[PDB]
Amino acid sequence: RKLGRTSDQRKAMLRDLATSLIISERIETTEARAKEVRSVVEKLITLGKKGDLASRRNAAKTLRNVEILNEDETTQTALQKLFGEIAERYTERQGGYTRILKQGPRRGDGAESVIIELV
């Protein structure tokens, strides 16, 4: 429960950060945001791992629209990738489908950078 901005803006940035990285398996961010986002993402992955329309309509409540370009032709949806792609990978896996990697400080403000990636 860490913050940064205001309570709603925090929500927005969290849905944005969560939808991203589903979109692309890994992203670069502040260590603080990484530690916040990891929860929201593993949770979306359990909604995906349930499979029911209930938990789908439920994942929809947080996750952003996006578009996603599948390899070669055709277009998915971040939702569709949550349920129809990522969840397939993680069925046998218990909890914790996420890791934070410690990049160290960036130039502009010296904030500590980290990579956050899937398996």
Partner: protein
């Protein structure tokens, strides 16, 4: 409120003894060369 008397070179330096920066905790990359910050990533190799 203002200082009522100027600080001497001596006072000002005594006030500065704790104003260093610590040398970063660091460690050698195993078989990669350039050293990195502790409990931090080994980079692209």
């Amino acid at each position: 409120a203002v200082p009522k008397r100027r600080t001497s070179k001596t006072r000002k330096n005594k006030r500065r003894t704790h104003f260093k920066i610590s040398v970063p905790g660091m460690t050698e990359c195993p078989n990669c060369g350039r050293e990195y910050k502790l409990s931090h990533r080994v980079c692209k190799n």
